Amino acid sequence: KRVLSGRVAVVTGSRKGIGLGIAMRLAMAGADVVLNGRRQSPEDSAIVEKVAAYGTRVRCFAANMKDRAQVEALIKFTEKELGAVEILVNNAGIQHVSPVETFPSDKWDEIIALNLTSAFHATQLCLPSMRQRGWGRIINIASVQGLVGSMNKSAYCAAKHGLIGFTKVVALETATTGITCNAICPGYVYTPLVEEQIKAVAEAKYGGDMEAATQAFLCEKQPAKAFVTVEQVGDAAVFLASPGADMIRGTTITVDGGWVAQ
Amino acid sequence: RVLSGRVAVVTGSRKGIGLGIAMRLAMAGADVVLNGRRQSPEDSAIVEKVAAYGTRVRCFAANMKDRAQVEALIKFTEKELGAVEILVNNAGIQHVSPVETFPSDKWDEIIALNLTSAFHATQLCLPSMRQRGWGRIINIASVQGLVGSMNKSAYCAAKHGLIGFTKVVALETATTGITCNAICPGYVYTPLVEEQIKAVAEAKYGGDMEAATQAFLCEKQPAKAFVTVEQVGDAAVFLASPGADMIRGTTITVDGGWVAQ
Amino acid sequence: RVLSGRVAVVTGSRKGIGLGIAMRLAMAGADVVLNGRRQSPEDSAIVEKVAAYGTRVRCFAANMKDRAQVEALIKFTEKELGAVEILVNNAGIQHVSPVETFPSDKWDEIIALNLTSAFHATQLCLPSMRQRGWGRIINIASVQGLVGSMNKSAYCAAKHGLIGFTKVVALETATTGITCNAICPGYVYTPLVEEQIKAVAEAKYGGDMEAATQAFLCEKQPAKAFVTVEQVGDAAVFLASPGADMIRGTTITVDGGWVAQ
Amino acid sequence: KRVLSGRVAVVTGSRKGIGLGIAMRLAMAGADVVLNGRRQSPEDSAIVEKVAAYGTRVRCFAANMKDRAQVEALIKFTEKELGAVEILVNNAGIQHVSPVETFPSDKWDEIIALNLTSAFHATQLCLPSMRQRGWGRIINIASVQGLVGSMNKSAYCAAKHGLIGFTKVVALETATTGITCNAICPGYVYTPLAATQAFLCEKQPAKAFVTVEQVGDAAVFLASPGADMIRGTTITVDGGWVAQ
């Protein structure tokens, strides 16, 4: 009765924020989902129950995406529990803000590895099964930062641009198959990552005024002056994984409220 | 059915992409107004095929170049069905020719139909959409609006301009419940592309349609397959959904990897 | 000099970006023909300035909307100086208005001047360039051809279309000695932009030109400074230089970072 | 006096091919140039003289750009011999053609490290001097693969896209200064690495190679005063590759 009934879905970094939203919207669309985190938490059961509220089979796994062996462990766990990985959502993404002059080298390395190389490892490990089964959906969670630049986000922008490029190459390498690769490029999304930013901006320039600080934060970059929701990102992912997008290959779905239209 | 009760208008939708977009909009539950240049004896059958999905579907004859007829269509839809909420500008005409010998008349026609008619329709529909607080404007551009192709100067220019207009409209309605976006299809199975492929087959491959079709596809589309009209309609339904509130001034490209290279 | 002996035609070069481009092309050794809609008493002075660089200079009054006058300009250049070897399509106008109340005549004029005139000039100039085996067709687009801006729907659509046309022309001539590239300036310190700034200062900042300029630049250009006409001319000279033989169908964006965000 | 007379430039990965062309065209413009290579070779002397043929001070340094310490050694050597680094051309890069399924992990890491992260290291080490002096040029030699995708070049395309994004961010971070950051995106260039016509005809509509000299010309344009307001953009020299 649902578009994605019987599809096995694996979302990296899906125990919080955008990844959790994508997992929720995929399970709502009828897909079994494997949530991924770094290490187990007492609330793992609560999150798993929240996603399972949609009637699909839901699993949880704690794999550090930086280690390729753990990525392979995640894929094999999904294959054993639910069957071949059919939808792969490369969402693992961290942020660090600093001018290029003072950007720590280890932080740059971590951002590049987690946002770019982890997607490479997961795609490499999942492609053979998708080719064997004649169907697949590689969805990379990029940002508007993958299309345009922003100050003090050199590592993030470079990683997301590279993720879009890798999306293009993977789409081209599978163009004559039942496997598509595409990227989602959200704008600002309300999350702890952004709530801490809003609180810091209130400390800096707005003196603890939440409403004005948030309004200015959005007015800077998003013309809509509104936050993109995790549900909207997940709905874009569901559209990408839907049959209607069988010929959507190597492109971007931009959910930004106008950020890259200027 | 994410579009129950929505009133939608599709321009140039008696055949090809517009027809499929109308069908897909009907499946979502939206009343749909088709359109073509002139009335046809085929109106009954086509409208019935679209109506098979249990939505109020009408047919109107208007010339999108003439703004008076666009106003007539908009008032027709406002009174027959209701206030226009989903506007689809599907432009059809195409003339292939090198720049040196491209007729001025056909260049003007291509720019006026692919670009100016969308501007007129958007200008006329925006007041009602701002009043109602909701609106979805979808411009059916092409991949030619993102990149260039030989002997398609007018078409590429018009589609690029359509994308630019999409961006400006989206920015001018950013804080409303009105979004404007564009869909960019590649080679799509339709009678017009079939005419192009027949020309190619007669010119280069001794009239063999299969060989000419493969040559046509492999030139630009890595997928080596046609984008179908149903996929364009699905993209239009995705954009027009209320869940696309924060999708503004962007392109949804359905081209089988064309623009990725 | 770099372009010594080349015959160049810059459209709309009686002031602003066009005059700067003419000056910088002549500084590179190129003969230049300036163009205006109406003959002006200042013509001679302008000529003198360009002629300060020692090349041959001419002036011609012809609105690019009329293709007949465009052909008159081309044949005038051929008579006086020789074959048109560089073609700078720069004639541009602006009309800031919301889409809802955008006048139809202004939209039509903007599309015609900013897009169709380039088409006519390129069409008339291409055959000679093909015969000679060398040519440069430099279209002066804007950042508005790459992104959208509120109340600039017509202008953005026209510049996007100009970029598409540049791509198609560059592709149709890829194997020849003719290149087609577009320049995308941001806010450029010219009389026109000063008029726009004065308008916004009177309407919004109580006549304070400093405040209006600060708001104008900070809204769009990260450099918080103007692009000079000399810089656009330098980009044009670079595109017309021999080093740019393999620069085809691309954009040289001079905007202080407008599109980088 | 020439347009770039008095400028001190460092071109990384410039022992051959694109980097050597860029260096020689910068020298033609009057700039002083420090070439860089992974390791010393006899050719070093020869190459140093070739650039030096244009009457500018030229030096050579052997330093693996994947190592930050060696990058800082290169920069400090240039400061020692010629002076502060005013022009920085991030050009070191390599290619490895393979499908994503069988792409060796170490090769992916090396391509990312040399095409993207070495640019970050060089820029980070050079920016303070350019800010204090108030003038700087950072030219990152990207590729058409930084703009579009190509089969069996996932690592390369990813690295070049990231390099372009880094260019945009740097340009934005230096917008109100005399420092511009821009990226050149060449197509197929005539380098050591009937078949020729088939090879070109697929990607370059011009059906002709791009020269290293043309890449150098684009770099000279970016480093000239006419480019003071060109920031965070791409100069694409590809014979029409990206126009389709």
For chain D, the structural domain boundaries read 8-237
Question: DSSP 3-state assignment of C96?
Answer: coil
List C-alpha distances in Å: B110 to B104, C44, C171, D234: 10, 40, 20, 31
| Interchain proximity D153–A163, CB inside 8 Å | no
Task: Please choose, from the candidates C160, C256, C190, the residue with its C-alpha nearest in 3D space to the C-alpha of residue B182.
Answer: C160
Q: Determine the Cα angle at A197 with ends A193 and A199, to 5°.
A: 120
Fold type of domain B7-188+227-254:
Rossmann fold (3.40.50)
The interaxial angle of helices D68-81 and D118-133, nearest 10 deg, is 30
Distance, in Å, from the CA atom of A71 to the CA atom of C26, rounded to the nearest integer, reads: 62
Distance, in Å, from the CA atom of B130 to the CA atom of B143, rounded to the nearest integer, reads: 30
Task: Please choose, from the candidates D196, D199, D116, the residue with its C-alpha nearest in 3D space to the C-alpha of residue D150.
Answer: D199
The HSE-up count of residue D13 (CA atoms within 13 Å, CB side) is 19
Q: Out of A232, A242, A250, name the one closest to residue B246 (CB).
A: A232
Q: Which amino acid is at D26?
A: L
PDB resolution in Å = 2.8
Question: Given A54, A156, A188, A190, which residue is catalytic?
Answer: A156
Nearest-CA residue of chain A relative to D144?
Answer: A165
Structure tokens at D221: 């344009």
State the CATH class of domain A8-188+228-261: alpha beta
Nearest-CA residue of chain C relative to A219?
Answer: C219
Query: Per DSSP, which regions of chain C are E strands?
Result: 7-10, 31-36, 57-61, 86-89, 135-140, 178-185, 251-254
State how beta strands A179-186 and A136-141 pair: parallel
List C-alpha distances in Å: B76 to B59, B72, B80: 10, 6, 6
DSSP C226: P
Distance, in Å, from the CA atom of A238 to the CA atom of B243, rounded to the nearest integer, reads: 12
Q: Which of the following CATH numbers is that of domain D8-237: 3.30.1370.30, 3.40.50.720, 3.30.70.100, 3.40.190.10?
A: 3.40.50.720
Under 8 Å between Cβ of B55 and B28: no
| Interchain proximity D127–A100, CB inside 8 Å | yes
List C-alpha distances in Å: A56 to A6, A22, A25, A52, B87: 9, 14, 11, 6, 36
Question: DSSP 3-state assignment of C138?
Answer: strand
Give the mutation candidate from D90, D121, D154, D163 for the A interface (greatest A CB count, under 10 A).
D154
Distance, in Å, from the CA atom of C13 to the CA atom of C92, rounded to the nearest integer, reads: 10
Distance, in Å, from the CA atom of C160 to the CA atom of C148, rounded to the nearest integer, reads: 10
Distance, in Å, from the CA atom of C129 to the CA atom of B239, rounded to the nearest integer, reads: 45
Rounded to a whole number, what is the distance in Å from the CA of B259 to chain D's nearest CA? 7
Rg (Cα) of chain A, in Å, rounded? 18
Residues of D in contact with A169 (CB under 8 A): 100, 149-154, 157-158
Backbone φ and ψ for C35, nearest 5 degrees, come out as: -135, 140
For CA atoms D10, D12, D16, D20, give the dihedral sign.
Answer: negative
Q: Determine the Cα angle at A119 with ends A114 and A123, to 5°.
A: 155
Residue located via tokens 């839901």: A58
For CA atoms A204, A205, A206, A207, give the dihedral sign.
Answer: positive
Residues of C in contact with B157 (CB under 8 A): 115, 119, 161-162, 164-165, 168
Distance, in Å, from the CA atom of D148 to the CA atom of D158, rounded to the nearest integer, reads: 10
Distance, in Å, from the CA atom of C131 to the CA atom of C43, rounded to the nearest integer, reads: 33
Q: Determine the Cα angle at B189 with ends B184 and B193, to 5°.
A: 85
Task: Please choose, from the candidates A118, A139, A117, the residue with its C-alpha nearest in 3D space to the C-alpha of residue A251.
Answer: A139
Residues of C in contact with D221 (CB under 8 A): 238, 243
Distance, in Å, from the CA atom of A160 to the CA atom of A150, rounded to the nearest integer, reads: 12
DSSP A91: -
Looking at the DSSP bridge assignments, the partners of residue D137 are D87, D180
Q: Is D156 a residue of the active site?
A: yes
DSSP string, C209-221: HHHHHHHHHHHH-
Residues of A in contact with B222 (CB under 8 A): 171-172, 175-176, 249
Q: Out of D68, D109, D159, name the one closest to residue A105 (CB).
A: D68
Residues contacting residue D42 through CB under 8 Å, at least 6 positions apart: none
| Interchain proximity D109–A117, CB inside 8 Å | yes
Nearest-CA residue of chain A relative to B233?
Answer: A244
Structure tokens at D96: 């490895």
Q: Determine the Cα angle at D36 with ends D32 and D42, to 5°.
A: 105
Buried/exposed code over C163-175 (b: 16+ C-beta within 10 A; e: otherwise): bbbbbbbbbbbbe
Looking at the DSSP bridge assignments, the partners of residue B33 are B9, B58
Phi-psi region of A13 (alpha: psi -120 to 50; beta: other; left: phi over 0): left
D→B contacts (Cβ < 8 Å), by residue, are 148-150, 243-244
Phi-psi region of B207 (alpha: psi -120 to 50; beta: other; left: phi over 0): left
The HSE-up count of residue B15 (CA atoms within 13 Å, CB side) is 14
Residues contacting residue D56 through CB under 8 Å, at least 6 positions apart: D27, D30, D31, D32, D33
SS (H, E, C) chain D: CCCCCCCEEEECCCCCHHHHHHHHHHHHCCCEEEEEECCCCCHHHHHHHHHHCCCCCEEEEECCCCCHHHHHHHHHHHHHHCCCCCEEEECCCCCCCCCCCCCCHHHHHHHHHHHHHHHHHHHHHHHHHHHHHCCEEEEEECCHHHCCCCCCCHHHHHHHHHHHHHHHHHHHHCCCCCEEEEEEEECCECCCCCHHHHHHHHHCCCCCCECHHHHHHHHHHHHCHHHCCCCCCEEEECCCCCCC
Q: How far apart are the first and last CA of chain D?
A: 42
Find out whether D39 is annotated in a ligand binding site: yes
Under 8 Å between Cβ of C211 and C170: no
Backbone φ and ψ for C55, nearest 5 degrees, come out as: -85, 170
Rounded to a whole number, what is the distance in Å from the CA of D51 to chain C's nearest CA? 19
